[PDB]
Amino acid sequence: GEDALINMLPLTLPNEMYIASTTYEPILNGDGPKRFDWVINGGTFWSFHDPRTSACSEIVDIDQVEAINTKELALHDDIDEQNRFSHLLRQTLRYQTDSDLGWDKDHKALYFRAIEREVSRNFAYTSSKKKTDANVVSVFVRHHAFSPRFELMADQWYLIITPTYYYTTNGYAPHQFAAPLLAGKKRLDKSAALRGQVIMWHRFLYLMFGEPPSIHLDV
Amino acid sequence: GEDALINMLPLTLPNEMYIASTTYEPILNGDGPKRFDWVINGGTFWSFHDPRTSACSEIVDIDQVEAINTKELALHDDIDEQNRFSHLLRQTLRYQTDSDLGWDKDHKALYFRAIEREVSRNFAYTSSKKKTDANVVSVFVRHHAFSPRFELMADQWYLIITPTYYYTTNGYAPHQFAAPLLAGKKRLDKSAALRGQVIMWHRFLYLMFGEPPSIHLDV
Amino acid sequence: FETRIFDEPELEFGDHHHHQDPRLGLSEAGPLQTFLGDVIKIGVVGNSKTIEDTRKFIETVSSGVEGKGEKHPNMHPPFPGLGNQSPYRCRFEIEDGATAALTKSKLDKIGKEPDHYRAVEMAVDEIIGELQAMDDGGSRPDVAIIALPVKLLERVWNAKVDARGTTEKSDSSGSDAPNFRGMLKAKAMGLSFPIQIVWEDVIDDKVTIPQKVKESSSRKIQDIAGRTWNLMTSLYYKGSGRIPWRRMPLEGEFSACYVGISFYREADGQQLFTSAAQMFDERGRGFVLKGRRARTESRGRHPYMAREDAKKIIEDVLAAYKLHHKTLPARVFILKTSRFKDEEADGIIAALDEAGTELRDLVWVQESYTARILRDGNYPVLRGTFVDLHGKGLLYTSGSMPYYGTYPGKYDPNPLLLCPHHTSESTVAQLAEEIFSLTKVNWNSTQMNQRLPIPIRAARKVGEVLKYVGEGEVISADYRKYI
Amino acid sequence: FETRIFDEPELEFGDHHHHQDPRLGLSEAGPLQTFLGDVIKIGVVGNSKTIEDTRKFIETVSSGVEGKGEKHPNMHPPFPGLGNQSPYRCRFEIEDGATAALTKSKLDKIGKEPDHYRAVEMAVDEIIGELQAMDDGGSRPDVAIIALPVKLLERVWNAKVDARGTTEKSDSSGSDAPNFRGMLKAKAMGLSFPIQIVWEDVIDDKVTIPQKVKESSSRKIQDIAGRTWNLMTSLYYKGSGRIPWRRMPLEGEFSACYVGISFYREADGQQLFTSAAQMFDERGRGFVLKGRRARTESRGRHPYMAREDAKKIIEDVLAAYKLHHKTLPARVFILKTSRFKDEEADGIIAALDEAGTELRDLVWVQESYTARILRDGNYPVLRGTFVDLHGKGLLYTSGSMPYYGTYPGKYDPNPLLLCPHHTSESTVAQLAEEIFSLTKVNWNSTQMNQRLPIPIRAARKVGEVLKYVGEGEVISADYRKYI
RNA sequence: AUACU
RNA sequence: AUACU
Ligand SMILES: [Mg+2]
Ligand SMILES: [Mg+2]
């Protein structure tokens, strides 16, 4: 009845992991799709789903694929395996929406990429009650973003989304000569803005993200 | 005399400093010249030369200017004063040629600006022998840069420049997916290219930079 | 999952009175029932103006101020007289001779040197010599209000905010700057005076604080009745040796030891990680027990007690508990705001193994972790927010308040970590309840807000004071020398 | 500015012979003096194949190899025999019955575990156990070769490069990785065993190194003649306690003490910056004297000696000098990796004011300056170039070589910031010359190059060894236990 | 350093 | 950990 949203995504993964081994320190560009990045582990190669016989980027040696299920390897007890797997998940999430979303090194954000100058695009997603739009190219330029974080919680795997409003700086320039402008917009009323920014974020959607849990009791 | 070049740039400064004090700490904009930069010391709004009545962009306190000679504050025995003067000179240098030189927060470089994509703006400058051209807009896009540093050295206020290629990022693609292309192929012979790239950087030429010293014997 | 939101615990006031805010509980019942001395001598040290208006402050609240504001009468009750109805049943008496002046030349000579360390050093040393000259005889100055003039205030604050000190995650002391408060409390440790440091903004808000001090500290003081509520309570706490209010445990009383393992740094030699117990028992006494050099993982960072170090620390905590009371601790609650190493946990377990009916209770806390939960609002209680995240028990204990009517914070709440060790024989719910029973027991304030429990909150104060206590010096386990 | 390019320092070789290349000086004259009692027992520890081909490879170089390459004959002279043409004139024989075996099951049990620390820990313990079972009686093994098989090699190297250790500038210990070399030298300190650690590539050039070890270490051996030049010299250095060469300057021939103050963290407790002397006199003896818990500026970083600590450390350096020779130092040189603080410098002046005729000088050397002075190149000499920066003497010693005929490096040189203190009584050129005189005394090598002089070059080795020596254990001032 | 977030 | 950069 009094349930509320949760800022992490219940990832659903198939029974295929494609464990391998390489020698690299993470990208040699590529010649095909945008899934030719160095999505590797610390010493070994941890790839993901692929429509080819070889793994991603075609740089790992042939006949060195374990091809084991997710439950055998991704569920470990030491924190080093969790950190490695979550870094891999962040790497395969950043280069998954590369044609639409960009990543910046400061503040750790996946923002909307600008197509031109003085953009007037709108993002619309469906809902059960009505249709709600969002303007993410507002110029006074800033767009919308989020930050991913690591979480396992034993049974499943999670990417934590923090909806930063990204009001400071956007465009081709890295920073508008260090000129930020932001304040507190969200409030602890019956509704909120951050959760809203979580709900209307759908550009992140074999990383088949489930809906955030939103099951709570507040007696 | 087997003289060799040094990569330090002497500074010639007028007898005006306009020391003041206002509560500010880093960049307001929208008034006049791009020189609306918070040239901010450790608690004192000590800016540089004042063309109008009020320093910078009339942000500083009007009735607090000092206008002292160069030897009063540029020469000091305290290392903290030298570091503050170095930071102030860096802030004046970065925001002086900002119409055609950009600054990046990583690697600390002042690189050439790109007007658009697929740039054809190779830089030609005159020398004593003949006109020397440089491919500062090379596309395979990378440009030319330098990293600045300041120190006093007990007689002047030299600026040290490290002539590094840009080799990464630029405006065509934000960060080229974390993939530089470089080899560090510099030459150790009777001549070099770092001395070259120091000489063919005339884009910083009030912060009137003198010629680099190049007074050596080298027996 | 399952979301648990706990209620406010019961604070004991006076003689058998229930729980309210620490101000309202300390207005109808007063402090605890123990026939101690009813006279506290409050000999003020400062110049003539600060001593004069401190005496005017004591005179003007003996009748009672009626300051209020906003709309909620629960948040800002007034502070009535100090001498007629007074809950402490105490005389806030000031005597001549103890009021020792600082003249004007010495204030200028300590406010004119541009060195940040040296200025606060002489400001500490001159008044320490003044208190030593007070200690020889004449009266019994149980406390000493340290009133700071505007020049001294600006000097000792700009020595802190303009020294460009850095912070650290596991350093439980502060931000590396020269602290006037910690230095005064450290150099007054050998003294017999629990001292109180005030400003003149607390006394009279007629002199303006300079703009640099206002902007660099974000200073916005409360009303007249709201400023003497957190000061006279701290005055009665220091000069009597009695705690004003008593917390009440829930899951069995017996004996308890909520020892807050923290690792401060002392600015004497190598900036050691010599650690501190900061033990708080079931009633609230701050048994401060520093130990030896706790081991570090790499380059002097990420500290942890070694196995021998952990059993020695727990042994001196048990020694302090058995010295104060004739009963061994039936439960020891380690509260680290960092992860538990296996060697440290094994040492603590081996030390607890020689205790009858023992109860090891280990909890991991980590600061600056980003996972916002219960995405709702004020209506759904938001102070006691805690969700069982399948093992780890992330909790933020600050937010919207019932019985207030508004959210007192100006920013969004931030969470910490609550992860029990695998050796702990308790669920995350009962350890969460014990974290949310370490509430409203800070003697530095009368607030009912909380984001750090007092073994975690008091770590900052203990590391503030024990930063400037040199090697080979006996320290005090009495909590009156810290806050 | 004015630029001085000093000449190469010379060395003394044999009985009254001048300086050639350090291999060439160690091929026509040999070691320094006292060519009597030429017995060295070189009892090897390893498996059967490794001991067998170690003895075989010693047998090949006993006649003399003729390896050469490239074009310059000065850089790659051949390695002579071990008989009549032996430069050391010493018995390089293996002690019979001192071939301590490691079998095969123990090697697999070390190489199979996934712990980086524990594998090298029990490898060190196994080697130490065989050395302790060797030194009980039977013969006199003056030196020992710890020859490592490839299965042990990959394990002890990937325990280091895959441990993800960090670095810091003021520390000389290395990079926090478990070091096989440092741990073996620390646990062999109580022994009478100077020990040499080799790889299977040095013995036989037939077994391949795995690609992970090749890429993670950039391993590229030289020829057979160029591989045993750096090994048998280190073998003779660690036997009989006699250095094979010395410098011959004329500035301070009465007394000299180039005490290279550096700071290291010891991985026993808090990784405290317990400091070391690393004193090198006018001949090159490495008097290693660990100091005390030196004060740090902030949070355990930027160490400096306290005034009492500085005077105590200089006092024990003077005590070591007066123990070895019947003359107090008169030319104490301090060589720090950071700028001199006022307290440390004042402590050093206070300690040295007790001594006699003082020509004391202090020099700051700061790594990684950004001013590429003297943009001339190879045809003028770039090794040993510095610029008088109106008080500072910014210097790099790495560059082009006249005798080599080519630039031996693969990257551009990076300089050091030579800054004399204001109490130094000598010009910057004299201090630069004295730093340049500390070049070819590296007993870890047999070539002519420098980027760090041996009071700073030896800081790495001393902090490597003394990282693991525990508290309360007596350390050795003999430099044989470090390189 | 009257307090808290 | 054969050595240097
Ligand atoms: Mg208080
Ligand atoms: Mg060696």
Author numbering:
A (entry chain D), B (entry chain E): 161 to 186, 193 to 306, 318 to 382, 400 to 413
C (entry chain A), D (entry chain B): 3 to 485
What did the study's authors say about this model?
The structure of the guide-bound complex, determined at 2.93 Å, showed that it is dimeric with the DREN domains being flexible. The guide-bound complex is predominantly dimerized, with the DREN domain missing from the cryo-EM density. The interactions responsible for NbaSPARDA dimerization occur at the APAZ–APAZ and Ago–Ago interfaces. At the APAZ–APAZ interface, F354.1 is sandwiched by Y261.2 and R260.2 to form π stacking interactions, while Q353.1 forms polar contact with R279.2, and Y349.1 forms π–π stacking interactions with Y349.2. At the Ago–Ago interface, R301.1 of NbaAgo.1 inserts into a polar pocket formed by a flexible loop (aa 168–178) of NbaAgo.2, and forms extensive contacts with the surrounding main chains and side chains of E268.2 and S174.2. Group alanine substitution of the interacting residues at the APAZ–APAZ interface or deletion of the flexible loop at the Ago–Ago interface disrupted the dimerization and mildly impaired the collateral nuclease activity, suggesting that the guide-induced dimerization plays a role in the process of SPARDA activation. The gRNA in the guide-bound complex is mostly flexible, except for the first five nucleotides, A1 to C5. Specifically, the 5′-phosphate group of gRNA and the phosphate group of A3 are coordinated via a magnesium ion, which facilitates the charged interactions between the 5′-phosphate groups and the side chains of K187, K240, and R183. The bulky nucleobase of A1 inserts into a hydrophobic pocket formed by W201, W159, and F182 and forms polar contact with the side chain of N181. The C4 oxygen of the U2 nucleobase forms a hydrogen bond with the carbonyl group of Q224 backbone, while the C2 oxygen forms a hydrogen bond with the carbonyl group in the side chain of N232, explaining why uridine is preferred at the second position of the gRNA.
The short Argonaute-based bacterial defense system, SPARDA (Short Prokaryotic Argonaute and DNase/RNase-APAZ), utilizes guide RNA to target invading complementary DNA and exhibits collateral nuclease activity, leading to cell death or dormancy. In this study, we investigated the SPARDA system from Novosphingopyxis baekryungensis (NbaSPARDA) and discovered an unexpected filament configuration upon target DNA binding, which strongly correlated with collateral nuclease activity. Based on these structures, NbaAgo is divided into a MID domain (amino acid (aa) 12–50) and a PIWI domain (aa 250–485), while DREN-APAZ is divided into a DREN domain (aa 1–146), a bridging loop (aa 146–161), and an APAZ domain (aa 161–442). Collectively, these experimental results led to a detailed working model of NbaSPARDA that highlights the importance of the transition in assembly form during the activation process. gRNA loading, tDNA engagement, and guide–target heteroduplex propagation lead to the “monomer-dimer-monomer-filament” transition of SPARDA complex.
